[PDB]
């Protein structure tokens, strides 16, 4: 019956090896889970983050746009004044 | 009959079902970090642009300011030897 009982022995010693396979697969699977849970809390940050960024940035652009040319207008009343007096 | 138990089988099969699950969320994961980096990259970028920009208003105001003043004595100037 030895060949019967190996027989018994491997049935379970292959299972053992299988089910903890298999737990170690859960575990894995969790664990990465847990790190997709974090970066994805540090990636909505960063978006967010992106998103007021590229809105300061956006006005930023129109003020420095606004302030050049109310600056070269205001600088042009002088010199059309200055032409009027030497032409005076 | 001796191990047809063992080869059938569904123990095996959603062992494999879970694997598959184990290597999407793997590369879910690995596709996100690319995803991170890039808007990372963009944050970086802006952030130098956007500090850059108020130094520059900044420095237009008073370059402004001072020309704007100068015409202004000019002007002054002007009418006074007139």
Do not use: P
Not at 16 to 45: R, S
Not at 50 to 57: A, K, Q, R, T, W
Not at 61 to 87: F, G, M, P, Q, Y
Request: aromatic share 6%.
């Amino acid at each position: 019956r030895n060949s019967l009982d190996l027989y018994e022995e491997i049935l379970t010693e292959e299972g053992t090896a299988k089910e903890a396979t298999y737990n170690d697969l859960q575990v894995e699977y969790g664990k990465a889970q847990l790190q997709m849970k974090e970066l994805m809390k540090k990636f909505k940050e960063i978006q967010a983050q992106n998103f007021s960024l590229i809105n300061e940035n956006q006005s930023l652009k129109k003020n420095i746009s606004a302030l050049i040319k109310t600056a070269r207008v205001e600088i042009n009343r002088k010199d059309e004044e200055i032409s009027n007096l030497h032409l005076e």
